């Protein structure tokens, strides 16, 4: 279908360039990377400091480029522990100019399991939408260090 073709064009033109996480209260950087975690079909890995689990809120900056125009770029993210969804998050970016590079700031705000239990057992599944069109699904396995 035209929508399936369109999804592939958007993916083809998309790159996640860099990204970081900060304690929202203090602004202190907890993690940063330049690996494109959005790439589908391979299991990505990331190592994050265990103190992140003590943050009431985490600020994420995500820098991306897109050759394709998007009407309503957004993300759905599911936190899975041993295959069980503990949490679902929704973030909206909105309009994306074709051939632009953009920085997107988001706030991520139950009782947390210990880092030692969680480590290597947490998968973040991220879906990349333009409105209702699914562009891609990626997975990142988290280790708490």
Task: List contacts with ligand 9GD (CB under 6 A).
Answer: 16, 21, 31, 37-38, 46, 48, 52-53, 55, 57-58, 60, 62, 77, 79, 86-87, 108, 110, 112-113, 118, 122, 124, 126, 138, 140, 142
CB of 82 to ligand 9GD, least distance (A): 11
Largest CA distance in the chain: 48
Cα 34 versus chain centre, distance: 13
Nearer to ligand 9GD, 85 or 97 (CB): 85
CB of 59 to ligand 9GD, least distance (A): 10
Nearer to ligand 9GD, 2 or 42 (CB): 42
The dihedral sign for the CA sequence 141, 56, 112, 79 = negative
CB of 66 to ligand 9GD, least distance (A): 13
* Phi, psi torsion values for 27, nearest 5 degrees: 80, 5
Nearest to 129 by CA among 88, 76, 84, 80: 76
């Amino acid at each position: 279908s035209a929508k399936d073709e369109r999804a592939r064009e958007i993916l083809r033109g998309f790159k996640l360039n860099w990204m970081n996480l900060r304690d929202a209260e203090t602004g202190k950087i907890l993690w940063q990377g330049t690996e494109d975690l959005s790439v589908p079909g391979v299991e990505h890995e990331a190592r994050v400091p265990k103190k992140i689990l003590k943050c009431k809120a985490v600020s994420r900056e995500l820098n991306f480029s897109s050759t394709e125009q998007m009407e309503k770029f957004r993300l759905e993210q599911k936190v899975y522990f041993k295959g069980q969804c503990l949490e679902e998050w929704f973030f909206e970016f909105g309009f994306v100019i074709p051939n632009s590079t953009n920085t997107w700031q988001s706030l991520i705000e139950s009782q947390m399991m210990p880092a030692s239990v969680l480590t290597g057992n947490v998968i973040i599944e991220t879906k990349f939408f333009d409105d209702d069109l699914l562009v891609s699904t990626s997975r990142v396995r988290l280790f708490y260090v």
